Amino acid sequence: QDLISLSHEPPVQDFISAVHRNSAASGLFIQAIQSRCENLSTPTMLKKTLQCLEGIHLSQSGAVLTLYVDRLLCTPFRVLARMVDILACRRVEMLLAANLQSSMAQLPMEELNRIQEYLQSSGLAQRHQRLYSLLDRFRLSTDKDWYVHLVKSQCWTRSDSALLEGAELVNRIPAEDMNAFMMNSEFNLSLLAPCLSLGMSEISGGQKSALFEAA
Amino acid sequence: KPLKALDTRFGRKLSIIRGIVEQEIQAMVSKRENIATHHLYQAWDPVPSLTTGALISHEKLLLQINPERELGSMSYKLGQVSIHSVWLGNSITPGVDIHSCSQFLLELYSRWILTPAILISEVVRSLLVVSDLFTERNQFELMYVTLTELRRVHPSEDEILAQYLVPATCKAAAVLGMDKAVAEPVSRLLESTLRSSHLPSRVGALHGVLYVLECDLLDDTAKQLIPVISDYLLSNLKGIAHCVNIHSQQHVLVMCATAFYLIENYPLDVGPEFSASIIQMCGVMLSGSEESTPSIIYHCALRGLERLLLSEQLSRLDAESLVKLSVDRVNVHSPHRAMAALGLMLTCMYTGESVIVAMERVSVLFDRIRKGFPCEARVVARILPQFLDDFFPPQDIMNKVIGEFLSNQQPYPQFMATVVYKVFQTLHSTGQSSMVRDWVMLSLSNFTQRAPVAMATWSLSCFFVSASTSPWVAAILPHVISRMGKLEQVDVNLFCLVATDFYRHQ
Amino acid sequence: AASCQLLARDYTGALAVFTRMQRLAREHGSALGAFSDVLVRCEVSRVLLLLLLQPPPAKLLPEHAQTLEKYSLPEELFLLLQSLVMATHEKDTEAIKSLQVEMWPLLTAEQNHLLHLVLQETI
């Protein structure tokens, strides 16, 4: 932490650039980062660990692919996620540009299976297209119930950002069955306030609403 | 009073549209003193019905709030109880017992008037403030008698007593019948106090003018001492024409409020050149920059101008001048001032070769869709479907909608797609639904030329879900506009579904 | 004046005053001292006001274009402002929640009101 934390100083920055010219020293460097990942979560410390992992030895770069997928990419700081993604796409490019004998004997097949199962099992592969596309090409180098199913698809979820359109999808439910399709197992309680507001907008203008009664 | 221009088959739609406009004006401009929470639908006016009754909703009192008041501000401001309410609440026309407390106060202040100058000033100010609660004509008689006795006894070189005394004497005279023995000293008092140097003496005298001019059918000799006030209003609108930030704020505001009242309810007593000069000076007042004329002065003068427009009194040339000034202030850049001027152009296009004029002003509203902050565009997208549906026949509005939805100089076609949906389902009369199908075919022949691909497929998907069958395809349209960009295999599936559903719709 | 307009809910006037403050601080700071404090307060609050009301590119002046190109001042709050611009452009609400929890001590009460309004009108 003190090595990365002082990286703007010329002796320790020249030291870090001297680490990148040795294979086993950079491998021990990335093992040292993997050992102490939990205390590197503040924005300045992660920004310095991304400035120190930008250019390393071109073999060991395959290993930093793993550290760009498993640990650092799940941070909620979006520029840190973006910069991990830029560096990881750069590593997969510089891995594809090298020899296949040096890359296939480095990056395992079952470990790449673990990486892509972590990408597909989480939502991170839907976020960033280039990383999953480059990993896949590295693999390749070697109407009523339908509307009910639609509102099941876009209301029964963890959380959304579209709350107005969600309440408008709840609006033209056939209104004889609202509590069957609102009082359910996992219904969003953040969609439940725009249901109240739009039901009040329907009551205060004209004929009464079933949205406001149900909500 | 509640207007004559409403309660018609035409006026109700105008009340709806201006209810939307003024509703999000009071979301943007207003001062939440009534309101504690953060919600959008919080507009609330404490005007009761009138032996009191229930509370009147805000959508029913559209332009009843006086121009003396800041938008949604709640404080005592010398115009709380109108003498309409004095004459018809308590039936006098020429659960706490408040009446006994008011009688005991009149006894106390009549004995203290008849003591240092400070107590006399605060007692007359007290008497004017407590004067909203008097429920008997004898109380106003005793009020006016004690105040004329104070005017006779106390000397004249005390202007603080004057600025707390003049509205009290004028209101005590205004509740009573405005007879000659009452009208001569009150008008002499007002003509004397309008020449003073103390500025809230002018403010209190002008509120007293508003109480005198309010409801009493007034004497023919006493209405000839009106044009002193009219000369005062001409001079102090010509003086405060250019600069408003320098002089004052509440003086100009109450002064324009009584000027608009004199235009509205007493037309014939003053010449038409006076109302023309007020419309000219207020057109100058609206045309100031964002630092010259403040927001409260702007909105109050503007609300008074459309108050005069909804009255059936003004001539057509001054109405056309207000149309031109309203357009040239629609073209201002601040969002709430543009919204208020949009309310002006709504009320201008409602109290009345004209088809080309409608083309021009609807193009003005679309240019205010293009440039403009998104709350303003929310308001215009809420207005514009029933607007175009009920003005002029659908071929020209359909050419405008097709020609200005697909522009690359459109910042976002989101709200415009909601407009397209509401316009299509307000154009689903059957013989017009055939015309709808013809416009969809012509627009598709325009759609065959390419936009960027994800944007093009999304706009086509919104257009097919927009103009479609009744039961369940239209309800998808919020979800269709939930994702604006971001092409997907789900997007291709739903686009194919609605396109094949329209292939059998013909 | 800008604090008074953020009290009275005139946000576009606050944009105009904040850009005027930054321009008069760049003409007279080339910073020195409290001109840099003026610049820090403006460079935070204009970004919060450009995220609150999101202007179309017609009324988006090139100074707004330069600073929205700069983000899309100390390193912590600069990093969190870049992350919050990237989160509101992507509309990712849980990230904005975890940013309001961690930008609350770093901002003054006017910036906390503006960041509350940005987090409100995107959900």
Side-chain angles (χ1 to χ4, degrees):
Chain A
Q1 301 175 0
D2 296 330
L3 198 281
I4 301 164
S5 176
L6 294 170
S7 298
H8 56 89
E9 293 300 313
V12 61
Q13 185 179 3
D14 291 331
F15 174 75
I16 290 168
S17 69
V19 177
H20 303 302
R21 296 180 181 179
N22 291 320
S23 67
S26 66
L28 187 140
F29 186 72
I30 191 171
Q31 293 297 321
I33 294 172
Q34 290 182 359
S35 179
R36 300 288 178 88
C37 184
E38 62 181 2
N39 210 166
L40 297 169
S41 67
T42 54
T44 58
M45 288 294 170
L46 279 174
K47 183 177 175 65
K48 290 183 180 179
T49 61
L50 289 173
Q51 289 187 357
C52 292
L53 290 173
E54 183 173 0
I56 64 170
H57 193 198
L58 304 180
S59 68
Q60 198 70 38
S61 68
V64 87
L65 194 154
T66 67
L67 186 142
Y68 287 164
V69 175
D70 302 332
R71 296 287 184 267
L72 302 184
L73 201 152
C74 296
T75 59
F77 298 156
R78 289 294 95 195
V79 290
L80 261 48
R82 179 65 178 268
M83 189 163 67
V84 166
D85 285 322
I86 289 172
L87 293 176
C89 293
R90 184 176 295 171
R91 295 298 182 184
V92 182
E93 286 176 351
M94 297 177 75
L95 191 145
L96 291 174
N99 211 171
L100 293 175
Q101 297 178 357
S102 65
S103 66
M104 288 299 291
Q106 180 182 6
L107 186 62
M109 188 66 204
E110 62 182 0
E111 200 274 331
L112 202 284
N113 288 319
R114 186 179 295 274
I115 288 173
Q116 287 189 355
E117 283 179 352
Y118 182 73
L119 287 172
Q120 293 298 113
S121 67
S122 66
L124 298 172
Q126 294 177 356
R127 296 290 300 275
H128 302 284
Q129 296 176 357
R130 292 183 181 178
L131 190 147
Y132 185 76
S133 69
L134 287 175
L135 293 179
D136 198 2
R137 73 182 68 189
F138 174 70
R139 291 182 66 250
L140 291 177
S141 68
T142 60
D143 289 331
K144 298 181 182 180
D145 294 330
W146 179 64
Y147 185 78
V148 176
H149 187 273
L150 195 280
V151 76
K152 284 181 182 178
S153 177
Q154 285 92 27
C155 292
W156 280 253
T157 186
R158 291 179 65 191
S159 65
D160 289 331
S161 179
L163 298 177
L164 300 174
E165 290 85 3
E168 291 179 353
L169 289 174
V170 174
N171 192 2
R172 196 172 290 114
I173 285 173
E176 194 272 332
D177 47 359
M178 285 292 179
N179 295 112
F181 291 159
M182 189 178 291
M183 186 178 72
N184 210 171
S185 296
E186 188 177 2
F187 183 75
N188 286 318
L189 297 176
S190 296
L191 290 170
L192 197 273
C195 185
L196 287 166
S197 71
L198 197 145
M200 176 263 176
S201 70
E202 290 180 352
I203 292 168
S204 69
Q207 193 273 129
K208 68 182 181 181
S209 177
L211 286 178
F212 185 77
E213 295 183 356
Chain B
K1 291 182 180 180
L3 291 168
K4 182 65 70 177
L6 297 178
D7 288 331
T8 63
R9 295 292 303 274
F10 184 71
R12 293 182 180 93
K13 308 300 291 295
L14 320 181
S15 68
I16 293 169
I17 295 170
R18 188 170 170 83
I20 294 171
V21 174
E22 189 176 0
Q23 195 174 11
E24 292 198 1
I25 285 170
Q26 290 182 355
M28 291 190 286
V29 179
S30 176
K31 184 178 180 180
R32 289 180 178 174
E33 186 67 28
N34 293 113
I35 308 159
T37 62
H38 74 283
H39 299 279
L40 196 282
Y41 300 101
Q42 291 295 99
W44 183 60
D45 195 10
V47 173
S49 68
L50 276 73
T51 61
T52 188
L55 197 279
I56 298 173
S57 66
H58 187 74
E59 64 184 1
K60 192 184 288 184
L61 42 81
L62 184 64
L63 288 178
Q64 297 301 107
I65 299 169
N66 49 3
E68 295 175 354
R69 190 165 301 278
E70 184 179 359
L71 265 294
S73 70
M74 287 304 299
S75 178
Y76 183 73
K77 203 176 265 78
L78 290 172
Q80 297 287 319
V81 177
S82 302
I83 69 171
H84 288 288
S85 177
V86 179
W87 288 355
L88 70 92
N90 303 114
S91 180
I92 44 169
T93 56
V96 176
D97 293 331
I98 307 168
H99 188 75
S100 64
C101 296
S102 66
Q103 286 181 352
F104 187 73
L105 285 177
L106 284 179
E107 291 179 354
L108 287 176
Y109 304 135
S110 67
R111 289 181 292 173
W112 286 356
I113 285 169
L114 300 178
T115 63
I118 309 162
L119 282 172
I120 293 168
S121 177
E122 294 293 326
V123 154
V124 178
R125 188 259 188 188
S126 168
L127 186 143
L128 181 270
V129 167
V130 173
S131 183
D132 296 329
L133 274 305
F134 291 128
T135 62
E136 184 176 0
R137 187 178 181 270
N138 196 2
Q139 288 171 349
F140 293 98
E141 290 176 352
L142 195 150
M143 177 175 175
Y144 181 72
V145 167
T146 54
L147 287 170
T148 54
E149 290 293 327
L150 200 152
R151 184 180 181 271
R152 291 181 180 178
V153 171
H154 187 75
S156 65
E157 190 66 27
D158 193 0
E159 197 69 26
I160 301 166
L161 182 272
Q163 58 90 24
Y164 285 157
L165 181 141
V166 170
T169 61
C170 291
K171 183 164 71 174
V175 175
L176 297 176
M178 201 71 200
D179 292 332
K180 300 183 294 295
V182 181
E184 290 179 354
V186 169
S187 179
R188 185 179 295 170
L189 179 144
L190 290 173
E191 188 178 3
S192 65
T193 54
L194 286 173
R195 293 183 179 92
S196 68
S197 68
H198 206 266
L199 204 150
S201 178
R202 298 177 185 271
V203 175
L206 199 143
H207 280 283
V209 165
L210 195 276
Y211 286 117
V212 171
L213 272 298
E214 193 172 2
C215 294
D216 192 79
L217 59 92
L218 194 144
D219 194 2
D220 292 331
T221 63
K223 66 99 177 178
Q224 293 178 356
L225 294 176
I226 291 174
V228 175
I229 305 163
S230 176
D231 196 1
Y232 179 77
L233 293 178
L234 286 173
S235 67
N236 293 110
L237 286 177
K238 289 183 180 179
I240 313 171
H242 297 280
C243 58
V244 184
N245 199 5
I246 298 172
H247 293 281
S248 180
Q249 188 177 3
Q250 188 180 1
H251 183 272
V252 181
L253 198 150
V254 177
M255 181 264 186
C256 291
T258 60
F260 291 152
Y261 187 80
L262 289 175
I263 295 173
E264 183 180 1
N265 279 316
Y266 288 108
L268 297 175
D269 289 332
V270 73
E273 292 181 352
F274 179 67
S275 65
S277 181
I278 291 176
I279 292 170
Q280 182 178 1
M281 291 299 106
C282 293
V284 173
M285 186 181 289
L286 298 176
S287 177
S289 66
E290 66 183 2
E291 60 93 20
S292 67
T293 67
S295 179
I296 308 164
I297 306 296
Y298 182 82
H299 285 284
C300 290
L302 189 144
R303 184 175 296 274
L305 288 175
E306 70 247 6
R307 180 71 185 176
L308 295 177
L309 282 170
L310 284 177
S311 65
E312 292 86 4
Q313 185 62 41
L314 290 176
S315 297
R316 292 181 179 177
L317 74 161
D318 288 331
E320 289 175 351
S321 70
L322 287 172
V323 169
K324 295 185 289 293
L325 293 167
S326 65
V327 173
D328 294 332
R329 292 296 95 196
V330 164
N331 289 318
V332 80
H333 69 284
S334 294
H336 60 83
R337 295 192 183 187
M339 193 64 69
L342 189 145
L344 276 177
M345 277 307 293
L346 282 171
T347 59
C348 283
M349 294 178 75
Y350 284 162
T351 61
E353 292 181 353
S354 67
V355 181
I356 303 169
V357 177
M359 297 291 287
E360 185 181 3
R361 276 95 169 97
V362 170
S363 67
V364 167
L365 289 178
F366 283 114
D367 291 331
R368 296 298 297 160
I369 291 174
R370 268 74 172 272
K371 63 180 72 66
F373 289 160
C375 62
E376 196 275 335
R378 284 178 181 89
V379 177
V380 182
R382 287 178 182 178
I383 295 161
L384 203 140
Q386 181 265 121
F387 189 82
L388 293 185
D389 182 76
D390 286 330
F391 272 181
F392 66 96
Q395 291 86 18
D396 297 332
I397 71 171
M398 195 65 212
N399 196 2
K400 287 178 180 172
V401 161
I402 291 168
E404 293 175 353
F405 175 72
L406 294 173
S407 178
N408 53 3
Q409 292 183 357
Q410 180 68 255
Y412 51 95
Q414 180 76 36
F415 296 159
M416 192 66 205
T418 64
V419 169
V420 171
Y421 172 68
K422 290 180 182 179
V423 167
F424 270 108
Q425 282 187 352
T426 53
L427 289 174
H428 272 87
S429 297
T430 61
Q432 291 182 355
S433 70
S434 66
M435 296 297 106
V436 158
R437 183 177 61 85
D438 293 330
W439 284 108
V440 169
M441 293 301 293
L442 294 174
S443 67
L444 279 175
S445 66
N446 293 319
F447 279 128
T448 55
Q449 63 185 356
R450 65 184 69 186
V453 178
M455 190 66 204
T457 55
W458 179 69
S459 65
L460 265 77
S461 67
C462 290
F463 189 78
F464 285 121
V465 180
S466 173
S468 65
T469 185
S470 297
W472 293 101
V473 182
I476 313 167
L477 192 137
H479 170 66
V480 175
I481 68 174
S482 178
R483 57 178 70 93
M484 184 266 179
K486 291 184 262 74
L487 188 145
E488 188 67 27
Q489 194 264 334
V490 176
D491 288 326
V492 178
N493 291 319
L494 193 145
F495 175 72
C496 289
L497 286 175
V498 184
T500 54
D501 199 2
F502 186 72
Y503 184 75
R504 61 178 295 277
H505 185 273
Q506 295 178 356
Chain C
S3 179
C4 291
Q5 280 173 351
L6 290 174
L7 288 171
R9 294 178 293 171
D10 192 1
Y11 301 107
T12 74
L15 269 311
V17 173
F18 274 147
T19 57
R20 186 183 177 184
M21 284 178 68
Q22 196 190 13
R23 192 267 308 277
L24 295 172
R26 288 179 178 176
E27 285 187 355
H28 298 290
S30 66
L32 291 172
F35 293 101
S36 70
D37 195 2
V38 171
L39 289 173
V40 165
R41 189 258 186 88
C42 291
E43 284 178 353
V44 178
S45 187
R46 288 187 294 111
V47 175
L48 294 175
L49 286 172
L50 285 173
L51 293 176
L52 190 271
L53 56 94
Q54 45 188 358
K59 293 177 95 289
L60 188 146
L61 297 174
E63 296 176 353
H64 302 285
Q66 287 180 358
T67 64
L68 288 172
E69 285 179 351
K70 186 166 89 272
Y71 286 4
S72 67
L73 205 156
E75 291 179 353
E76 288 180 352
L77 199 150
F78 176 77
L79 204 285
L80 297 180
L81 285 181
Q82 280 187 349
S83 70
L84 199 139
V85 171
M86 291 298 291
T88 59
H89 286 171
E90 290 178 352
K91 296 181 288 294
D92 194 1
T93 61
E94 293 180 354
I96 307 170
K97 293 178 182 180
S98 296
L99 286 174
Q100 193 185 15
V101 176
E102 295 182 356
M103 290 178 69
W104 185 265
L106 273 302
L107 297 174
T108 194
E110 301 177 358
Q111 273 86 250
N112 288 120
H113 181 67
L114 291 178
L115 197 274
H116 172 74
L117 291 172
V118 171
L119 185 140
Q120 179 180 358
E121 293 182 355
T122 61
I123 294 171

